[PDB]
Write a protein that binds this DNA or RNA. Structure first.
Ligand SMILES: [Mg+2]
Lengths: 79, 123, 129
RNA sequence: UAGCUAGUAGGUGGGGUAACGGCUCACCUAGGCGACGAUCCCUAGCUGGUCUGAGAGGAUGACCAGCCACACUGGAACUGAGACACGGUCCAGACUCCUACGGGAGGCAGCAGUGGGGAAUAUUGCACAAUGGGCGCAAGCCUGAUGCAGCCAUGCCGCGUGUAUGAAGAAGGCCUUCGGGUUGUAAAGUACUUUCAGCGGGGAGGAAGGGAGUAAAGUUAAUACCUUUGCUCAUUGACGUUACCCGCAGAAGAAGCACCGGCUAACUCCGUGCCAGCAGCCGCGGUAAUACGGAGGGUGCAAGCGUUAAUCGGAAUUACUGGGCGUAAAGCGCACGCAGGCGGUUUGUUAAGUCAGAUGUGAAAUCCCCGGGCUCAACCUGGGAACUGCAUCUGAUACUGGCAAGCUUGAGUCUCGUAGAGGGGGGUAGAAUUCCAGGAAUACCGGUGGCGAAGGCGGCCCCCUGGACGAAGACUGACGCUCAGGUGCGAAAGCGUGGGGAGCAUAGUCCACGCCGUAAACGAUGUCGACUUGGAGGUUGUGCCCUUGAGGCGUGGCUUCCGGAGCUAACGCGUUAAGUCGACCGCCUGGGGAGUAC
């Protein structure tokens, strides 16, 4: 339990590894406008139990691989 | 403008350039006296002025006005530059340090001494 | 309106403040009842009657005291896409506080005194003067 | 600079580090990142804060403080708690140095210095006395970190270079219209005081420790030793012939610098006459220069003053708070649209957006407010506030946002008619017109008409197709508006390949298949939506009304013509906007060089 960062799945062409974007609002720092900004971070998961297009809950973990330091906890959305 | 036209590219500047290119971030550079030329100003003026092209030490060569009231220049020695362009002569964007290395003062001014090589007269 | 119901209302009212008509009327959402139930109470206009049930719509009565008209300089500020969510200890006092500042609070729209009494600000709706 | 990447991206494995690890080696998988700007070349050390700005914002990273990076230039490691190691080793070179020629030594991006490039930046200083460090059982050693002193107006804040009185308004200087005036109470001469410097003599604090003794309830042989507490003497500063206080002379040592036409506070004369010269812009000089040169007098500032260089400010002159585009630089020639930005209307609901409440945390030092200390001030300083921040719990449901459910006006399909140079093909064919046959294309209607997204498009009939419009009904329930790239349609000519040859420019013009995208492709007026005084004409409908009619009142749509308020620098716009607004896109930031160089 951190914030249980909600996100999506962008692509799975990898072996037990997925790609998650995260919706995120912000004040633009000088103009005062809300730009919907998204990030992109690799997430470890073993079962392939989430498909390309779901909605995913994520916490951190030990840094397993290169470029990937987040384990799946559970899924709240089918494809 | 629209807010989503300043977002995707910022307000760019209105860029300002230098017009004393004998900076190299410095105020005074040394020069070794190419010649002395005596060219003429434009239409509202007359009475041809005293200029010298100057071999710098950064690598450049440029011209400079030799103001005062008469000068003293044999032309294979040292001067010192000041900036602050003459309006009249096309190409002279400098001055000379009136009273410096090898370019001595003017012959007895008595008002506004310090901007020329004139010191306290006798007292 | 097409793309703000409250901005395009605020063109419709003060055009009545430039020819001095008696009654003005705009197609009226349930937010729009909660707009002019502030302008009446602070005294800027006088009376309003909602009518219609498939086109719920208002009958606002204007207020011009003279050739001078009472609602002087009303301005919407938070326009959609430029939300300015004011923290309450920044609050816009309108014309050195002499007007009122319609702020979309939690507890309603009626906002002069959210500065001290209610105690929570939000999105500005429009300055009023 | 739009593509980049194979140990690259991922997974079993071994192997590997203090640790997770593609950190490495075999094997499988074929990925990974990228318009929310990857690789690329150029440039740069980053923050607390300094400068400026009322603020936002703008340039900066020297000093003191945080954190990395580097030790002549490339490498690899050894030891070690910690290094890939500034005053350690090895491998090379490179310079550099030294040699009996065989060989060895070298590293100031330590403080102080030389060469040199430089506009220019300093001493081959003193002490371990302070506070910190290292090694130690301490004593003490050591410390070019620190504590101090010389150097230089580089900057800041003081401070003096005298104050009274005094005219005959003096000789004197220039002005002088020869009446005088001004410098000027200025000086002189009378009064008066010595700050600071000169010179003389005493004279705080930065010093606590340490070492020596001597006492205590210490724990042990109860008094040995040692550890702790209190007492006693001697003490211990580089700075430093110190700060500060006191003594005596004698106005005695102590005033420059720019400007004086306008902006911009202060003016008159000699000299020179478009020559010598000034200058920040405006400009002055060609016989009377308040501007050049000189002299009296004036101004502002002051132990400095000017000039140059450098950043912000004035600049609303890159504008978010704070701009504009019909003619002043500026609306792509025009269309659908992808990713982007933006929501009619009602209920439910979640709590991300945001508001509220605290709890963390934002290093101290600067900035800021009350308060202390240097004889004041700079400066040193106690506490506060502020650091506008980010992350978490609790709360709030009005707006907004995702999920769920709806309703009719945004939009959209159907019916039904209406008007029309919207096109494409097919042939047709004269009110007209040269040669011995046919190339052309409208006379008329033809216009302020009328079509279409624009360039545009006019004979006639049919053929496949395009859009709009009106009268009603019907149902869909936000399904939309906008656009960077993107892809189409693209006036002339030119050119390509395949022919022709009159009206008449000798190909080409003309059809045609391909390039070419060009222009006053100029409503020199993006698009959609909603609102606000109007008046007269255009044209397409169609409801009511004795239609009793060519006709009225409406009521649709687009296009003219003059005009209110409002607006615009005017000129002007003005219900088809440029007027009051909202969402979104294109574009401009002085002229020339230039739509040019690569
Ligand atoms: Mg002492």
């Amino acid at each position: 339990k951190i914030r249980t960062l909600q996100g999506r799945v962008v692509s799975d062409k990898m072996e037990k590894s997925i790609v998650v974007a995260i919706e995120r609002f912000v004040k633009h720092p000088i103009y005062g406008k809300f730009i919907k900004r998204t990030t992109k971070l690799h997430v470890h998961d073993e079962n392939n139990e989430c498909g390309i297009g779901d909605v995913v809950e994520i916490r951190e973990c030990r840094p397993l691989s290169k470029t990937k330091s987040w384990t799946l906890v559970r899924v709240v959305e089918k494809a | 403008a629209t807010v989503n036209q300043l977002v995707r590219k910022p307000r760019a500047r209105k860029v300002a350039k230098s017009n004393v290119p004998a900076l190299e971030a410095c105020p005074q550079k040394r020069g070794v006296c190419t010649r002395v030329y005596t060219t003429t100003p434009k239409k509202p003026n007359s009475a041809l002025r005293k200029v010298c092209r100057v071999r710098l030490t950064n690598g450049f060569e440029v011209t400079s006005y030799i103001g005062g009231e008469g000068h003293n220049l044999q032309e294979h020695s040292v001067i010192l530059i000041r900036g602050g362009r003459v309006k009249d002569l096309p190409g002279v964007r400098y001055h000379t340090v009136r009273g410096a290395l090898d370019c001595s003062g003017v012959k007895d001014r008595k008002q506004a001494r310090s901007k020329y090589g004139v010191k306290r007269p006798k007292a | 309106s097409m793309q703000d119901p409250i901005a395009d209302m605020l063109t419709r009212i003060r055009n009545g403040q430039a020819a001095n008509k008696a009654a003005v009327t705009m197609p009226s959402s349930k937010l729009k009842v909660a707009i002019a139930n502030v302008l009446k109470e602070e005294g800027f206009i006088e009376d309003f009657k909602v009518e219609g049930d498939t086109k719920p719509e208002l009958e606002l009565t204007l207020k011009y005291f003279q050739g001078k008209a009472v609602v002087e300089s009303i301005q919407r500020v938070s326009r959609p896409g430029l939300r300015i969510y004011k923290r309450k200890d920044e609050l816009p006092k309108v014309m050195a506080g002499l007007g009122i500042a319609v702020v979309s609070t939690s507890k309603g729209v009626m906002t002069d005194r959210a500065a001290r009494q209610a105690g929570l600000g939000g999105e500005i709706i429009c300055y009023v003067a």
